[PDB]
Structure formats: structure tokens, C-alpha cells
Design a protein around this ligand. Structure first.
Ligand SMILES: C[C@@H]1O[C@@H](O[C@@H]2[C@@H](O[C@H]3O[C@H](CO)[C@H](O)[C@H](O)[C@H]3O)[C@@H](O)[C@@H](CO)O[C@@H]2O)[C@@H](O)[C@H](O)[C@@H]1O
Ligand SMILES: C[C@@H]1O[C@@H](O[C@@H]2[C@@H](O[C@H]3O[C@H](CO)[C@H](O)[C@H](O)[C@H]3O)[C@@H](O)[C@@H](CO)O[C@@H]2O)[C@@H](O)[C@H](O)[C@@H]1O
Lengths: 303, 303
């Protein structure tokens, strides 16, 4: 059977790995030959694999709990634990972090490049909301041990001149990166170890590259206290859920990829993409591609 | 022609009129017999009608510019203007506010409830982001003149004890309501005037009511002298883009509605909704419906 794709431009699609920032370009990079991401992972048969969702914006904000302490050496990095409502009992067969939570990489061992939970605040002590939400720096684990630097687990630290209220719950809305955060450091994601069924690290077919649905992330700095040196960057994804939603009506034939026509202006320039059942859409043999264009189905091809 | 609906629960659907907040329940209220909203308006034949979009999360954040002034009477209500990237020249045939911007109502001439735009910050004077993004209160116009107090246009006011940098861009991410803003005040939307084709007011047929895809909006206060009166509330939407996205491969037949089966638990309880072409979900003849269920197509009925 044939596949019908609605003519929705990528500019009208959600960036699953970074909501609140629309898709600006389709990005091709020759130095990116893998994808160890946990957000934006979709499959034809398995649905939303890994830790992704079909509602990226809804599952974007999290909560954590203070741990009444600080990391060894650095007094400002108060330790804290991510709260998981989806996995209340700590089952080793289920993901530790809440579904849809951010997975931007920060580096192996770098006390110069920290993330930015642009909005973190304590509860109101009344159960109605939160209070004094402002920009703060965060990262996964403690940046000391091998198993807690890139671990994508529930332990984090928050940079704050004062001390967090012990045992009190806080909100988390990850928006921004600070320090020496380049685009390549955000493209990598923290390693996940354990038993739970996480998404594998995919690689493109031999000789082909990947379209990334890039977006521009602005800065959110502070001009007081110790200060926040946030920087502007870019974020990439595997594919938006909007494109792959249509494919579930008639799944791909057994061991068959699809040929997609990306048409920009009338019939002047029409690029060819090859979409696989594992989630990624490959091109061939990079440069940015405008988002004002629609995807059209050509035929079914063999890998 | 039949309509196949994917079994996606409403808890996995985006709330158009309030992203960053998952759908909590399906809400049906007897006193709500209309919807003058400009967000969440979709049509089977006309596409995204009014001021809505298929990417509510991407187009949620806005930018405004200062006007070097304040409202008469209240010194703290600095005046600004919402800049539209989709309508650079102020053509009266296009919507004044940028597409996808918030439309939460507040009440005409109200100095007791100022839904807070929450996150607002000045530009960094570097061209790469914004700085000191903090929680501030906002509203449309100046709450004095009938033509621009509650009229959903470019003029807004921001409450800030210190003056705003004149002629500089500011970021805004509206999230929260302050003062005595109940659920009913947020339900209504500011009136629309002009020549642009805005979404009309929808009234359900006699003897039927609506399903509202409601969600819970927390509070984000401030501990300072002036402070913020942020309160918790709920937000409702007419329709989610995920449901109407499917109904485009085969559009509805000539002047016929659809009968949808909402199946809960293990099929013990099945409710029957009526979906119309205007984009509203009729639920016959209010209480609260859980989101743990999937939609199923039954037949085509005549309104
Ligand atoms: C070397 C550096 O000196 C001070 O740096 C602060 C900035 O602090 C932040 O950035 C630094 C350098 O990248 C580093 O990543 C640190 O973990 C982080 O806190 C920042 O507060 C700016 C404010 O504009 O001021 C200085 O550049 C010191 O605070 C850092 O701890 C670090 O030793
Ligand atoms: C000092 C006090 O200020 C006003 O009441 C404040 C609140 O101010 C805020 O709310 C009121 C309406 O409730 C109004 O909308 C004002 O523009 C807004 O900023 C607020 O400061 C709270 C907590 O911080 O305290 C008071 O309720 C004013 O209404 C009072 O008459 C009085 O002057």
C-alpha cells in the first residue's frame, strides 16, 4: 500500500529534544555518524522507543527534591534527586528519570561547562505552586565518579550561593546552556547503563548522512552574585513525531525503506531523502536546508 | 469512507491553549455554552482556523518592545508593544498579535487580577540572548479604554517598580495567573476587532455539551515587597491538534458528523461523543472524565 503524507512544513513541527524553540533548518553534519539520544526516538513497530514521547512539551518540566548536602570540593553544588512519578518504586527494569525529561549532554569531566535549568524554585509551603523561579546551573550526578558524570540518572546538583531547603520539592524547566557549551557537546547525550530498555545508539547506512531538524537556543544569563555565563547554541533531534504519526496507518512493508521528495519552490528544486523504519531519515554522500518545504511520497526502495 | 483513529489517550495529547502542562481530565461544564478562543481552533476543511497552529509549543514564547512610558494612575504599569514577525508591516488584513501567542482572559478594567506573563527579561546587549529572566505580571492594553483594554492586540503593560530600557526587545513566556483570577476569567478571551478573519464564537447544539481537554496550571509567586499574587487555576481547550490531524486523509462526508467511542478501563464503560466539522467535541448531556482511554470510530451520523 501507498503512504500519504500531509503537507506540513518542518517549521510547523515540534522539536522533541527541545520544545519552545521552533525548527529553523534541516541540518546535515558529516562529523555526526551516531545518535545516542533518548528523546526523539521513534520506530514503526515499537512506537515511542527509549524515553521519548508523542507529547514533548507536556513532559518537559520536572521536579526534584533537595538532599541537604553539597558535592565534595565545591560547596555551591547542592546535591539533589530527580522525582519520578512514572516509576514510583525504583524498579531497575524501568527508566530512572521521568519520561520526556531533558538529556542534553554537558561533557565527560568539565567544571567549566554546566547546563542551565533556567527556572528553578521552591514550593510555596501551601501546595498551590512554586516560588521565586529564576535561572540556575545544573548537571547530572556530581562530576566526580565515573558512574555519575554521564549517567542520566536521578541524581543532580544545583549551583546556588545559599543552601537549598532540605527535603523540600523544587521545579525544573531546562532552558539554556552556560560556560563553554558548544553545539557538539549538547549533541552527545549522557551514557545510560543498567537493565531498562533504553534506545540503542543508531548509526547511518554506509555512505549516507542524517537530517537533524536543528533549532536555535538563545541565552539566559544573570548579572548578579556569582553570575551565569549562559551562551547561545543549537540543538538537533532525530525526527519530529509529526512526520511519523501518519506512517502508522499503513506500516512499511517488510524490509523496505521509503523515498521522500522534499520540494521547496514549486518544482524547481526537489531533494531526495530515504526514510527507514528505525526512525532516522538519510540523504546521501553537509549544509543547512530551509524549512519551508513539504515531504512527498515517491516509492518504496530497498536498503 | 471510514476514519481510523490511533489509540492515543488524551493524556498523551498537547493542550493548545496551555502547553507545558499535560492534559489532566476531560472537563464538561453546564455553564460553558460558548468558546470565543483564538487558540485550539481547528476545522476539518479550513485547517488551522483563527489564530491557532499545529505547533502550539513552538510558537508559545513571544517578544515585545518598550514604549518609554507608563499607564496613567499606576506608575508601575510600564507600556509596551507586542511585535509580530509574521506581520512586519501592520497590514489590517492579518492578525495583530503573533501566531500562537497566549489569549487567556483577565476581565475588563481589573486591578485585582493580573495574569502574570511570568518569565520576562531584557536583551543582553550582545545579540545572543536575554538576561535576568524573572517573574512579572502583565496584561493587555491599559485597562482604561474600551478599544484597547481587553481587545487582544499589540499594546500591553508590564508591572515593574523600576523603569524599562526604552526601545529594547524583551522576552516573554506567559505561564501563570495572579490575584483573584478564577477559572472562569481565564476561560473567556479578549475580544477581536478589525478586518482579519478571526475564529467566530461556537455554540453547541441544543441539548448537547462540550469536552474541554482541561489541565491544571500551578502558581509561581515572588517573595518581595511588591511581589506577585500568583494563584493556581485550570485551563481548557476546544480541541487538540492530535485528534483532528488523523481526520484529513478522508475528510468527513457532506454534512455528516462522527460518532466516537471513548473506551475506559477494560471496556466496562464506553461513552459516546459526537465530533463535528467545526472542531468541537460534543458529549451529549457536568462531571469529570479520566484521560485513561482511547478514541474509537463508530459511524457517521447526521446533525
Ligand atoms: C574559572 C571560574 O571563575 C569564575 O567564573 C565565573 C562564572 O562561573 C561559571 O563559569 C565558570 C567559567 O566557565 C565555570 O563554568 C563555573 O563552573 C561557573 O560557575 C560566572 O559566574 C561568571 C558570571 O558572569 O563569573 C565568572 O566568570 C567562578 O565563579 C567559577 O567558579 C570558575 O572558577
Ligand atoms: C501595597 C498594596 O499593593 C496592592 O496589593 C498588593 C498586591 O499588588 C498586586 O495585586 C494588586 C491586586 O491584588 C494589584 O493588581 C497590583 O497591581 C499588584 O501588583 C501584591 O503586592 C500583594 C502581595 O505582594 O500585596 C498586596 O495585595 C494594592 O492593591 C493595595 O491597595 C496596596 O497598595
Amino acid at each position: 500500500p501507498i503512504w500519504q503524507i500531509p503537507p506540513t512544513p518542518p517549521g510547523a513541527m515540534v522539536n522533541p529534544r527541545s520544545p519552545l524553540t521552533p525548527v529553523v533548518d534541516l541540518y546535515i553534519n558529516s562529523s555526526w555518524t551516531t545518535c545516542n539520544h533518548q528523546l526523539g526516538r521513534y520506530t514503526i513497530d515499537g512506537g515511542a522507543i527509549g524515553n521519548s514521547t508523542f507529547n514533548p512539551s507536556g513532559l518537559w518540566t520536572g521536579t526534584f527534591t533537595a538532599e541537604s548536602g553539597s558535592v565534595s570540593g565545591q560547596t555551591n553544588w547542592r546535591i539533589a534527586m530527580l522525582d519520578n512519578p512514572y516509576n514510583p518504586t525504583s524498579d531497575p527494569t524501568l527508566p530512572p528519570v521521568p519520561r520526556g525529561f531533558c538529556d542534553w549532554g554537558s561533557g565527560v569531566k568539565s567544571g567549566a561547562r554546566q547546563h542551565l535549568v533556567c527556572f528553578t524554585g521552591v514550593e510555596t509551603d501551601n501546595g498551590e505552586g512554586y516560588k521565586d523561579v529564576d535561572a540556575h546551573m545544573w548537571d547530572y550526578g556530581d562530576d566526580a565518579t565515573i558512574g555519575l558524570d554521564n549517567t542520566y540518572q536521578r541524581q543532580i546538583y544545583i549551583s546556588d550561593p545559599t543552601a537549598l531547603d532540605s527535603g523540600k520539592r523544587y521545579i525544573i524547566i531546562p532552558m539554556g546552556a552556560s560556560g563553554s557549551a558548544t553545539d557538539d557537546t549538547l549533541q552527545i547525550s549522557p551514557n545510560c547503563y543498567g537493565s531498562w530498555d533504553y534506545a540503542p545508539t543508531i548509526a547511518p547506512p554506509l555512505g549516507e548522512q542524517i537530517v537533524w531538524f536543528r533549532s536555535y537556543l538563545p541565552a539566559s544569563s544573570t548579572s548578579a552574585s556569582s553570575g551565569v555565563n549562559s551562551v547561545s547554541a543549537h540543538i538537533s533531534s532525530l525526527m519530529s513525531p509529526d512526520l511519523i504519526r501518519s506512517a502508522y496507518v499503513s506500516g512499511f512493508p517488510e524490509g523496505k525503506a521509503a523515498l521522500l521528495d522534499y520540494v521547496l519552490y514549486g518544482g524547481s528544486v526537489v531533494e531526495q531523502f530515504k526514510m527507514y523504519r528505525e526512525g532516522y531519515l538519510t540523504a546521501n554522500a553537509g549544509f543547512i536546508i530551509p524549512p519551508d518545504g513539504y515531504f512527498r511520497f515517491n516509492s518504496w526502495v530497498s536498503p
